[PDB]
Design a protein around this ligand. Structure first.
Ligand SMILES: [Zn+2]
Length: 347
């Protein structure tokens, strides 16, 4: 029931101070690294993009892990869609700081990532910060702070052009946040992160995700007063915690390894579109609202369909990305939990 769910939310608050303190340590290192990348020629125009769960106020665990995005203003970008992926692109240009990374027409993510890593390792050595390494094109590089906090740093090109055609039917917020807001948001830049699908880049809208979370009501004053305290953020925190707790019960074989907080977040945005009124997220209806989120996530698993919220034809749950057996496995676990009032949350 809602009492059990409220107890979960109270438990998550116990970790708030550890996360904030660690976030401050990350900021100290990031600020130091950023001011020295301004010295390196290739990345002089780098800037901090304050995206990610901490800045969305929904980081509820893992105080030793942070995702940080650096942006790099890149004038005059023309994109070329890679195959028919809708989310992956080659970067071209209509001097140029990134001129040294061009192979013919195409901007090489491999060459640019290589310099980025090398330049960061050079600046890092010049206090108790070093560079770890993991799997994936983005994050580009990883810092280890005080031999304790791991910061995944993503480099993202910033394009101040209009969003790609593949986003034309995405961001379906008109009945919730308004058509006015949708137009305003689409005048904002978009980002490209280096990401294998080759020298491909993937669209990123983490800045818009943060805006939609921190200004999330139909009412402009949602969550600015006691009469309009909704449970949207609480529901996202509970969905994230549900997935984290289920993953913890398979640390051995990591059967749920393919599922991520980003899947949860994407599904949550879809539920906001489906339930656009603030009265559909009343604080007193926490249990029902959480049920709405869990049942939609279940539907995504069973139908093997979870559309990227900005790029509808990019299906995060296609069997190409996540095998059917893994989705059926998570379906069985979540179904059991839901039908039993979430014993995973029992104390
Ligand atoms: Zn609210």
């Amino acid at each position: 029931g809602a009492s059990k769910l409220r107890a979960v939310l109270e438990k998550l608050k116990l970790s708030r101070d550890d996360i904030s303190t660690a976030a401050g340590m990350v900021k100290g290192v990031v600020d130091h690294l950023l001011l020295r990348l301004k010295c390196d020629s290739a990345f002089r125009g780098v800037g901090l993009l304050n995206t990610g769960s901490y800045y969305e106020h929904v980081k509820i665990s893992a105080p030793n892990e942070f995702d940080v995005m650096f942006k790099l203003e890149v004038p005059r970008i023309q994109l070329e869609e890679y195959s028919n992926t809708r989310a992956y692109y080659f970067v071209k240009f209509k001097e140029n700081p990134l001129s040294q990374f061009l192979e013919g027409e195409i901007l090489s993510a491999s060459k640019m990532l290589s310099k980025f890593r090398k330049i960061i390792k050079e600046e890092i050595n010049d206090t108790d910060v070093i560079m770890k390494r993991k799997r994936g094109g983005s994050p580009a590089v990883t810092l280890l702070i005080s031999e304790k906090i791991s910061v995944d740093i993503t480099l993202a090109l910033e394009s101040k052009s209009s969003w790609p055609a593949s986003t034309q039917e995405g961001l379906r917020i008109q009945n919730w946040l308004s058509a006015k807001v949708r137009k305003q948001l689409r005048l904002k830049p978009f980002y490209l992160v280096p990401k294998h699908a080759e020298e491909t880049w993937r669209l990123s809208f983490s800045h818009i995700e943060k805006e939609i979370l921190n200004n999330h009501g139909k009412s402009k004053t949602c969550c600015e007063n006691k009469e309009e305290k909704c449970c949207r953020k609480d529901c996202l925190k509970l969905m994230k915690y549900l997935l984290e707790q289920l993953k913890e019960r398979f640390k051995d074989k990591k059967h749920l390894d393919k599922f991520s907080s980003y899947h949860v977040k994407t599904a949550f945005f879809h539920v906001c579109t489906q339930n656009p009124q603030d009265s559909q997220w009343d604080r007193k209806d926490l249990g029902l609202c959480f049920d709405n989120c869990v049942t939609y996530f279940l539907q995504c698993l069973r139908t093997e369909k979870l559309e990227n919220y900005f790029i509808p034809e990019f299906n995060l749950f296609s069997s190409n990305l996540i095998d059917k057996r893994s989705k059926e496995f998570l379906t069985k676990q979540i179904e059991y939990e839901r039908n039993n009032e979430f014993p995973v949350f029992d104390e």
